């Protein structure tokens, strides 16, 4: 059957200010089927106890989910989202960039 | 402005891993207000917005019973669909359905909806007349004939024109301080050098509700649709949404570009430029 | 309030 690969955006809830606690979001959308694996990473390591939204879908029937956790941006710490889906042969890692 | 109540139903089979999961979520506009999940430890219709919490036990009990019955009905439907497509018992399949009602600023019905998809492909839809069906293929025609024999469209019409809009109006009143409040985008333009020859101008819209927005770039007053990177509107996690639009501009030409923003929360549409 | 689903 026809499957759809996820779009991924990684971003903060509030404008990023180094040393100020915030929320790190990984929004996955546009995918089908609905099973998907999403991890948030800090310096390459999986953040524990990340929360997510309840499964729903867009007008075109593709699914979307928001994964989110507390984070404190700094100059040096690297954050990312790692996504696996049946359409992906390898997990896709998207780095957090405060300019996007 | 205008408003909608919608329920989004997803059922997913998983042979060898128990029975199909059913999840229902309910929204007014961009605000989720209920969920039900057959995979929860104790499946129940649960509040997901503060303004719904005041509904009495009869509301929670009635919706929970409807949803528990729906779990079984969707499992039957998935078995039937598998047969309609001559599919093996080995594969996983998805049945999605969305239904609900739209009202205008006066609270009057604009239209109703009841549409379904199987494995991500449109399967059957109630037409806007709330009286006839559009079936995608000969499998969906089986469902159509079954729903015609049982007068399903008549039952949906009665619900969509009565119960659905009455409850939507009630929710809009109970949650008026949020559901009927449009929060405008906070906007700004950033500049990101690429090379000696070009830079990106990115126009941001942050903190807006509802999600509907128009965000565009013009050069010399001409819209730059093909040359604009426009990300999907994304949730911030505080009820609001975010979006940006970016264009690549030749060095020194930045003032020829204007970003244009329209949103229900704005008193007037905005025009912005990079301000170095 | 929701409505019951109808068997496909
Ligand atoms: Cl992005
Ligand atoms: Cl159940
Ligand atoms: Na990024």
TrEMBL record, chain B:
<dbReference type="GO" id="GO:0031901">
    <property type="term" value="C:early endosome membrane"/>
</dbReference>
<dbReference type="GO" id="GO:0030670">
    <property type="term" value="C:phagocytic vesicle membrane"/>
</dbReference>
<dbReference type="GO" id="GO:0002474">
    <property type="term" value="P:antigen processing and presentation of peptide antigen via MHC class I"/>
</dbReference>
<dbReference type="GO" id="GO:0000139">
    <property type="term" value="C:Golgi membrane"/>
</dbReference>
<keyword id="KW-0472">Membrane</keyword>
<keyword id="KW-0325">Glycoprotein</keyword>
<dbReference type="GO" id="GO:0012507">
    <property type="term" value="C:ER to Golgi transport vesicle membrane"/>
</dbReference>
<keyword id="KW-0812">Transmembrane</keyword>
<dbReference type="GO" id="GO:0098553">
    <property type="term" value="C:lumenal side of endoplasmic reticulum membrane"/>
</dbReference>
<comment type="similarity">
    <text>Belongs to the MHC class I family.</text>
</comment>
<dbReference type="GO" id="GO:0042612">
    <property type="term" value="C:MHC class I protein complex"/>
</dbReference>
<keyword id="KW-0490">MHC I</keyword>
<dbReference type="GO" id="GO:0055038">
    <property type="term" value="C:recycling endosome membrane"/>
</dbReference>
<keyword id="KW-1133">Transmembrane helix</keyword>
<feature type="domain" description="Ig-like">
    <location>
        <begin position="185"/>
        <end position="271"/>
    </location>
</feature>
<protein>
    <submittedName>
        <fullName>MHC class I antigen</fullName>
    </submittedName>
</protein>
<keyword id="KW-0732">Signal</keyword>
<keyword id="KW-1015">Disulfide bond</keyword>
<keyword id="KW-0391">Immunity</keyword>
């Amino acid at each position: 059957m026809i499957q759809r690969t996820p779009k991924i955006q990684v971003y903060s809830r509030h404008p990023a200010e180094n040393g100020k606690s915030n929320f790190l979001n990984c929004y996955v959308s546009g995918f089908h089927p609905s099973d998907i694996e999403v991890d948030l990473l800090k310096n390459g390591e999986r953040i524990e106890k990340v929360e997510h939204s309840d499964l729903s879908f867009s007008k075109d029937w593709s699914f979307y989910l928001l994964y989110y956790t507390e984070f404190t941006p700094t100059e040096k710490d690297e954050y990312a989202c790692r996504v696996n889906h049946v359409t992906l042969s390898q997990p896709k890692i998207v780095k957090w960039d405060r300019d996007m | 402005g205008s408003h909608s109540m919608r329920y989004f139903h997803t059922s997913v089979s998983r042979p060898g891993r128990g029975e199909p999961r059913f999840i229902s979520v309910g929204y007014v506009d961009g605000t989720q207000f209920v969920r039900f999940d057959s995979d929860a430890a104790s499946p129940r219709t649960e509040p997901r917005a503060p303004w719904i919490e005041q509904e009495g036990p009869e509301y929670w009990d009635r919706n929970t019973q409807i949803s528990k019955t729906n779990t079984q009905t969707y499992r039957e439907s998935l078995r039937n669909l598998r047969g309609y497509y001559n599919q093996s018992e080995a594969g996983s399949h998805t049945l999605q359905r969305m239904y609900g009602c739209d009202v205008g600023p006066d609270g009057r019905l604009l239209r109703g909806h009841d549409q379904s998809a199987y494995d991500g492909k449109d399967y059957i839809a109630l037409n806007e007349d709330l009286s006839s069906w559009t079936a995608a293929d000969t499998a969906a025609q089986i469902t159509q004939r079954k729903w015609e024999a049982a007068r399903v469209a008549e039952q949906l019409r009665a619900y969509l024109e009565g119960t659905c809009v009455e409850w939507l109006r009630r929710h809009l009143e109970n949650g008026k301080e949020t559901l009927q409040r449009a929060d405008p985008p906070k906007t700004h333009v950033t500049h990101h050098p690429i090379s000696d020859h070009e830079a990106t101008l990115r126009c941001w819209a942050l903190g807006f509700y509802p999600a509907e927005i128009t965000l565009t770039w013009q050069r010399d007053g001409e819209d730059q649709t093909q040359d604009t990177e426009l990300v999907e509107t994304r949730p911030a996690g505080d009820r609001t949404f975010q979006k940006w639009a970016a264009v690549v501009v030749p060095s020194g030409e930045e003032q020829r570009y204007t970003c244009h923003v329209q949103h229900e929360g704005l008193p007037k549409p905005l025009t912005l430029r990079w301000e170095p | 309030q929701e409505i019951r689903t109808f068997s496909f």
